[PDB]
Write an enzyme that holds these catalytic residues in place. Structure first.
Site, PDB file in Angstrom:
ATOM      1  N   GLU A  89    -104.021 -28.696 124.722  1.00 26.83           N
ATOM      2  CA  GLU A  89    -102.997 -29.319 125.558  1.00 26.83           C
ATOM      3  C   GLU A  89    -103.070 -30.820 125.768  1.00 26.83           C
ATOM      4  O   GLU A  89    -102.078 -31.531 125.570  1.00 26.83           O
ATOM      5  CB  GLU A  89    -102.937 -28.636 126.933  1.00 26.83           C
ATOM      6  CG  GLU A  89    -102.468 -27.182 126.882  1.00 26.83           C
ATOM      7  CD  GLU A  89    -101.027 -27.058 126.449  1.00 26.83           C
ATOM      8  OE1 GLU A  89    -100.256 -28.007 126.686  1.00 26.83           O
ATOM      9  OE2 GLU A  89    -100.665 -26.022 125.861  1.00 26.83           O
ATOM     10  N   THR A  90    -104.236 -31.317 126.160  1.00 31.51           N
ATOM     11  CA  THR A  90    -104.380 -32.738 126.453  1.00 31.51           C
ATOM     12  C   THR A  90    -105.678 -33.359 125.933  1.00 31.51           C
ATOM     13  O   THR A  90    -106.028 -34.460 126.347  1.00 31.51           O
ATOM     14  CB  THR A  90    -104.383 -32.975 127.992  1.00 31.51           C
ATOM     15  OG1 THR A  90    -105.547 -32.364 128.559  1.00 31.51           O
ATOM     16  CG2 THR A  90    -103.142 -32.388 128.660  1.00 31.51           C
TER      17      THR A  90
END
Ligand SMILES: [Ca+2]
EC number: 4.2.2.n1
Length: 312
Positions: free
Chosen positions: A113-114
């Site tokens: 995701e990040t």
């Protein structure tokens, strides 16, 4: 002193003459006690981002899986994953105990995701959500609900709505939670009384809660690779066949399937051929975060790669 500004009924900015923005303000005032003038000041600063609209519209064997996988499973990502895991080991262990979701899954989700907080988004959530709510008929109702929840979230956690940044779709923090997910699944895992999507401890617990809420079975297998080929059967995380039907198709599990009597037929393009897998319920739970076989397989294997790199 007090300026009611009852006569200031028309806002400026990108959404100045937008009927949808007007109805949204009415909903917020009527349903949640928002002040019309205060909300108009906020929305007057909101920007219509055409890039957000273009992106939302934009969404063998040749080695498809291999290309997707190498975007996530690299020495840099595995090493950074190890650092994040060791740094937040207590939170990860606590999440395992409370929710039954293992560290490699949470580490894998936050990594895909990040990259463990390195890429959390640069778009103002308010701009993205107002754009998608007010200038995108196709998903206007869905995004209006998100903007509503976002403004309520900002009001409750006491954030200036214009300060928060995230994805082109309004996703936030370490786990890239949508406002509705913050509302239904985020938990104050750090225990300071506040739910902060940008606090890695809270995000860890929130991702674990999301997984348990979506049916994650503690200790159960995610997927088991198959020996054999099943070209005659449609595949994908949404498919469903009994183990008996898969065997008849020429498949055998590399690991015992226990009590599982059905499974999805997953197929990975490994260049030289196709690699079939028996998708078990936990694999489907991972796809609840992002409806994609590649996504879930990358989350799982990145988590596995970090788990191994930690043992070294
Ligand atoms: Ca907290």
């Amino acid at each position: 002193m007090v300026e009611p500004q009852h006569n200031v009924m028309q806002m400026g900015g990108d959404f100045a003459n937008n009927p949808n923005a007007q109805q949204f303000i009415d909903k917020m005032v009527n349903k949640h006690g928002f002040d019309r003038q205060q909300l108009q000041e906020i929305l007057s600063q909101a920007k219509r981002l055409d890039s957000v609209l273009r992106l939302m519209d934009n969404q063998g064997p040749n080695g498809a899986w291999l290309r997707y996988r190498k975007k996530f499973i690299t020495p840099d990502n595995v090493q950074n994953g190890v650092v994040f895991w060791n740094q937040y080991e207590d939170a990860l262990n606590r999440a395992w105990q409370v929710y039954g979701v293992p560290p490699e899954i949470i580490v894998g989700i936050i990594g895909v995701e990040t990259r463990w907080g390195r890429v959390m988004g640069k778009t103002r959530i308010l701009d993205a959500l107002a754009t998608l709510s007010f200038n995108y008929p196709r998903r206007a109702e869905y995004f209006s609900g998100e903007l509503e929840t976002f403004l309520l979230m900002a009001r409750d956690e006491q954030d200036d709505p214009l300060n928060l940044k995230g994805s082109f779709a309004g996703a936030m923090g370490y786990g890239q939670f949508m406002p509705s997910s913050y509302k239904q699944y985020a938990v104050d895992f750090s225990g300071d009384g506040h739910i902060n999507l940008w606090d890695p401890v809270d995000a860890i617990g929130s991702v674990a809660n999301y997984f348990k809420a979506h049916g994650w079975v503690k200790g159960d297998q995610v997927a088991v690779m198959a020996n054999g080929q099943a070209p005659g059967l449609p595949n994908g995380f949404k498919t469903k066949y009994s183990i008996s039907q898969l065997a008849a198709a020429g498949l055998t599990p590399q690991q015992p399937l226990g009590n599982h009597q059905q499974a999805s037929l997953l197929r990975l393009d490994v260049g030289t051929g196709y690699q079939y897998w028996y998708g078990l319920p936990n694999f489907y739970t991972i796809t609840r975060y992002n409806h994609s076989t590649h996504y879930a397989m990358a989350v799982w294997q990145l988590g596995q790669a970090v788990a191994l790199a930690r043992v070294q």
